[PDB]
Subunit: 271 residues, 6 copies
């Protein structure tokens, strides 16, 4: 019963704290240490929350954190879940749906992603301007509940245009080159073949990852404002020799952490 | 029980009427009203027919109509079901399969669609020349009953070439400018991102919608002849602001209706 | 149970024969007759092995052959299964997983494919350099077992680079012109529309088929070496009349058969 | 001396007749017999006109015909020159420049072209919606005279929207299927390689020929109205055997002549 | 004579002043005003220098200015010449070649360009990352004088990488959002058709212009560092209505003027 | 005079030797040493032959060598000329025209070329299947002589289908992996930008060079058979760092020379 399921998840959260978040922060693979810099009021493992799917993927701690970061009330997702784990597109989006109903109307979706655009560099940061779904799944498939949003949500300006100008302004202020581009959702969990990376780039994709797009679609359905940022942990260009390993991706996510944390806190401060 | 399921459904319709149709006609979003112009012999809602999926989408009454239109004996589907509503590709094509076995060996599939081709105009009509499946689902997936058709149907000339010439002749006759092109099945129910629209145009799609292709594949499996028409309700071009909403799609499908019913009737009269 | 299932299938094969295979050979549509040229020690219907999926498709016998071919101890799959038959990607790759655990560390994946590359010919043989997954399913989706392989297996050099050089050297020795290209997995079982073929060629696909890719991903997850070969049974280029029929794929696979069998035996001899 | 050059050519033609045309008509390779149907007042070979280039190319008589066709005062060019003859883009567009100053404010440019769009047929007629210059030559390169046109003429709607709607109407009126597309100017005089046809089609060309674009560019500089028609004499599609020879192009241009000559008359009637 | 020609022009400038520039700055259509802001020590009309071509184009003064700007010895080209004016590639680049031999080892190449990337804005500045020659002419065609540079100069890193990092650093310092992309050289002087604008975007051009590339090749021949900056004077995207008019390109180039001059000086400060 | 010019050159070669060649062999950048293995009857510098252009490009001797090689009467051109040197398309193809009228009806055109196809390797040899002309010049442009060939020569099968099958036969025999693909003629003499390489690859080119295509067109006009071979001296892949240098292209041509000469002599042996 999607809705009675959300309000159950909501009621269990309010049984631990009455803290109202304004800003949802989803932290991707290796990006979790930013939950530590929060001024904490409550911390809830996903496994205790009704109908929440649990993190199985490396670099995802599976913890909901509530409190103050850079003076904004925030719901931090230390970890997410992914379609490649065996979760449906619907099950993947249950956490940010709960966050929206807890009071979060602005969401920052962060990820570790591969760079398709050869002008990018590993350790770089990319602003999501738009997405492509190459995963063959959609979280809104099935009956629509009008209390969430419409049957056919408009996905133009999926990434909030005011939030991109803010991203840029902060990047400039911090003397940070900010990459911008299109994020492709690839189901995984096998990495892309050379011909798949070639195909996604030629179709207009600048970064490649296994997350984010279902949360974007689900949040726009609800009327939330969305900001997408990936740590470019590796160059996935088929005409170079090496594809990064899981170990290497999580290492560059950790190495890029300080600049990434300082950037996100700088966006939060101005929101 | 598939085939035995079909005969269960055929038999239930024959329990209401021995009327044998020559022509199937599926009316899509906001195209239902042509069904009111039919000299009814039977009018069965989908919910009452064994194994029939019921319509939940806006502008789909979900009523099977047997009768006379432009002097032809016709099976009219007042609305249809979609993959986005959470029916399998197989469940989506149950109706047109029953339609075939009632005796409709020629089918006109109609839909509301976005224009990808920038040359097209809102309010215009696009004859289907070919299709692209970007939904990742196929109604034939599963065991094949040789009684319906072959294991590996050929989808060359999926859109009947004689019916395409006819569709052109009738447009000329009615001083009507008939757009032509390739229909892309996008799974939905979220509308395409800018980058997804660009991606589908550049693969050679001229129109985008969320129906018809499973019907086309199911019906060529059976050896039926197929003609596809979309009302280009909106212009889906990503280097222009604003995608149409649900309200705007259905509004243009009602405005265009007199031009469109006059066209469908024109074709019916020559069959 | 996955792993426990593998081990029951393994245990059942060891109840008929203690023969340890080193090379796995998968025979696709109309390519079974190579299995008869094996010096048999055991032959086992798929239907009798625990958790094995059974071949339902034309020109797939559904039998596991262990023994000696051209000197090598071989596990020969006389037929495979396809996603189009109703089987999940996981179910499709259960056989090669079982083969790996019997000791086959090198795998030959054969198939009947359509030529997209207009420079190809019916009766041709294409060495696989890479793959494109257009079927929207991955056999590793779900929980991962470290006893099989890692969470995120790298799919660069999916088709082993030394077996590619071996396959060229043998084609040269035999005076056989070996075509080379990218195999696209299309889900089927409907053949592809003209526009879908144009779509696949322009994405970088040189051949189209309904098999192989899930096996490649599954086998690279395990760390097996993979050589892919396709009989180009038909030319599937959309700007020419007539796509091939099931009967025209099976006929050419058999006419081209002696040359194919001599070629595969050459590769085996040099392993 | 560009303009003085034009006025010298104006002078010499007015020396022979004071008749003022309203409509320019340029007959391409094999389309010349329409000049025979004119009601003549004067017939001047291009040789006798100061500063005119001369037709060396097969099926171009090289003669300026003035008079009356389907009730209209027309300047009819029975042949043109092309860039592949050795003439610069400036020399090519000299006749239609003189034609404008004789008072032709509306031009029909005809041509025999190859079909790049695989949905076209030999003996079809194509309406120019737009053009691509792949010839590396612009007729306006050099010093600009404002008495002719601006320095930088805008080439949107190079082909007149109203004369496009008109062309469609008459094609509907005559029960004639009217193909529509983009014209690519290829320098020649060698025909395009297979790879060149492929590249031109991929770049959005629907037709290839060795004329017409420079006339278009120069006339829109003058502020004239242009309608483009090619007789599609051959299917130039690179994954089919045989490119049309010179003998085959000029033959089908004459076999299609009746319908083409009826159609161009239809358009004249309505100006 | 080329080199003797260069020395003849070097001679004639050294006869008016013994000033030695370090930095060459070429001002495109409507960017000329920046010259007036220079602390003159000399000013020389192009018409008066040996072998110099003369600016005929709207918004090009045609004057060589020497002196001081933001504390750098600069050589400012108030205007340039273009291939569309009638000048050969080699003629077009003589000016920047003469500057190089005067001791300007670093050039900034400013231009008024259309925006092909639909994410740009009329009034934006684009940093050149790379170029595409579509004009069908190369300045180095003909004999090669080793005293200028090599027969086959490598065009990788044509736009200097340190100067790109510096363009970004300055943009960030000045809270200026800096567009980045590939400048396509279209010959003109006709603005591109819609299908041409489409062709050049699909080929990976971000901006279209009529200048700059010849100068880029010529300067890299000599070993000069090169920084490219365009004013996006208009959006050149073919699925919108109206191309910019000559009058509109010059207006927006003057309106962006103050920001463009603050930005250029910002860079000169740091060199 | 073109023809009277051919016959003066012919007459002058006949004033040194009456030796009649069947096979023409153009040796490109660094490939000249194959001339030294000819059993010479005569050796004529280009400088002394009426109307012959002279080689100014590095690694081109500029010497006509008549003689016997691998049992065939050959006209070996030790060096060629290039559009980039200042020669017109017409001037560039004079040598092969003189060759054809001397009696050479089969031509091997060899070249040093860049690899666009990333699977190619430096030091490898690529057979020409077809060509793309990106240079903007055609050798047949101007008046046509009917004694040379037709006005509009067909360029399909420009590269002889039987000589391609022979090329593959000899490569297999010699245990030589033979790359195959499309040769792009880029005018030069500057090397291509990163974006120009990407562009030429996406349009369907596998190699890039500054020669050959003019000689192919000129020779197909005359009705000669043409085999194209390129030594892939450098990998020109825009997403790799560093483009080869001239010095480096000539070195890899020298290094590949033994394998290349064993190969060409092998093709000659079976002609």
């Amino acid at each position: 019963e999607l809705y009675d399921k959300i309000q159950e998840a909501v009621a269990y959260v309010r049984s631990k704290t009455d803290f109202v978040p304004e800003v949802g922060l989803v932290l991707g693979s290796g990006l979790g240490p930013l939950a530590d810099e929060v001024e904490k009021v409550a911390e809830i493992p996903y496994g205790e929350i009704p109908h929440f799917p649990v993190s199985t993927a490396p670099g995802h701690a599976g913890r909901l954190v509530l409190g103050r970061l850079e003076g904004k009330p925030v719901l931090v997702y230390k970890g997410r879940v992914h379609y490649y784990e065996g979760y449906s597109a619907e099950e993947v989006v249950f956490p940010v749906r709960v966050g929206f109903f807890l009071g979060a109307r602005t969401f920052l979706l962060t990820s570790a992603a591969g760079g398709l655009n050869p002008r990018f560099r590993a350790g770089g940061i990319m602003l999501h301007l738009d997405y492509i779904n190459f995963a063959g799944a959609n979280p809104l498939r099935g009956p629509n509940d009008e209390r969430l949003g419409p049957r056919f949500p408009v996905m133009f300006e999926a990434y909030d245009p005011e939030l991109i100008e803010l991203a840029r302004k902060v990047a400039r202020r911090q003397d940070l080159h900010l990459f911008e581009g299109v994020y492709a959702w690839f189901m995984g969990p096998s990495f892309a073949s050379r011909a798949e990376l070639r195909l996604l780039r030629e179709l207009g994709a600048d970064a490649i990852g296994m997350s984010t797009v279902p949360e974007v679609i689900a949040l726009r359905h609800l009327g939330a404002r969305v900001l997408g940022l990936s740590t470019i942990t590796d160059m996935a260009v088929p005409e170079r020799e090496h594809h990064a390993t899981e170990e290497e991706v999580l290492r560059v996510a950790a190495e890029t952490g300080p600049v990434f944390r300082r950037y996100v806190r700088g966006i939060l401060a101005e929101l």
